[PDB]
């Protein structure tokens, strides 16, 4: 029923990237777009679901655009009141079929998935749950650390992102220009014996799409928060 | 991140089987527990819940223990009010460790799985959900009909009971001696686009595991009732 571990030839080397680094790192370092108690009020195409999410801090955007991966799981959550937690993105971001190629995009935003019920998910005296990290260097856990969350059933995109955050500035996974790590995957193992995988580093090439790489998260995958497993295998540029 | 299909050799053939077929109809044929608003009252092992659920119509029993995959996913509804459904079995039943191999049980009976939690799982109006039934026959088309369920996320043990429920009055899919079919397998496709199967015929030999063979359910798996497809996919034993 599961997806098996990576094989050598199965991950992104970073050294076969020659693009710019930071654009990954942008996606993880303190970047989210968090909405509480919404529903849907427009849709772009089949598959998909805006909602009017405003940027408190920043005020970047007043209107979030969420690809699912089909028209059925899209409306599943159409007419339902929903929170929102993922990674958003502006380059290529469309609204409508008047939008332009290479769009960089106003006061709107674009992101996959990252959607939770609302009603039913939160725990009972108003608590956190920590989920336990397991950083593998080299195949040798090197450090473990929590991260929290307000959900019972929350996506494999939260946790993922408060993850890399993390890692981003104890261990600098991604910074500038490279990386300190060649290769690099984020593992998530449920109670239910059920394993999937995602790949941390980005495609060979000289460019990074970032709209493509968060294309991971339209299936809206959950874990239970109380009872998942996660853990960040690395492997060093060296040795 | 999903299950592929079966190969030709993946599935158990009837002709294999040199037992009674009777005792897999036992399991499907007008066969399961169902309770409703219950709450676990105790434990035998680390992965199992018992509960207090009486039999209306036959009184066959008033206790019933389920075994989940581990002692985490039975945890998680250790402590939680919910429904049950799944289908029941009495032969190496056992609810303490002073139980012998080979008892029959009294008035207490065995289960996997078949758990979901009540509250925030039932339609708006109180309706029913009609979940579509593809028969494929050698490859054909033959026939679709639809099951019923008041679940918004339902187990796929409860789908997978009616669905051969009706398969065995409409197409004698299991009779007391044998089966019409050589092999077959009911395929779940979720919107989420997981896949997974089951095999529907029992293991080579003379002798069937009822225990052994409902193990299948033991890891609890649901989906979403209103946007699942279901796939019945069987081969005549002449051709
Ligand atoms: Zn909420
Ligand atoms: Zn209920």
Redesign the pocket.
């Given at each position: 029923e599961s997806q098996p571990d990576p094989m050598p030839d199965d991950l992104h080397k970073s050294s076969e990237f020659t693009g710019t680094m930071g654009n990954m790192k942008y996606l993880y370092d303190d970047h989210y777009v968090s909405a509480?108690?919404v529903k849907s009020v427009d849709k772009f195409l089949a598959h998909d679901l805006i909602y009017n999410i405003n940027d408190k801090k920043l005020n970047n955007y007043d209107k979030v655009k969420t690809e699912l991966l089909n028209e059925d799981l899209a409306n599943k959550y159409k007419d339902e009141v929903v929170?929102v937690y993922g990674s958003n993105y502006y380059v290529n971001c469309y609204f409508s079929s008047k939008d332009n190629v290479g769009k960089v995009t106003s006061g709107k935003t674009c992101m996959y998935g990252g959607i939770t019920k609302?009603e039913g998910?939160?725990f009972d005296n108003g608590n956190l749950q920590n989920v336990l990290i397991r950083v593998y260097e080299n195949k040798r856990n090197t450090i473990s650390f929590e991260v929290q969350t307000?959900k019972k059933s929350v996506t494999a995109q939260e946790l993922d992102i408060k993850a890399r955050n993390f890692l981003i500035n104890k261990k600098n996974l991604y910074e500038f220009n490279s990386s300190p790590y060649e290769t690099g995957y984020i593992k998530f193992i449920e109670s239910n014996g059920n394993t999937f995988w995602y790949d941390m580093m980005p495609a060979p090439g000289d460019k990074f799409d970032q709209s493509k790489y968060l294309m991971i998260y339209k299936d809206n995958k959950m874990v239970d928060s109380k009872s998942v497993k996660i853990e960040v295998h690395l492997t060093t540029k060296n040795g």
């Open positions: 509480t108690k929170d609302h998910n939160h307000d």
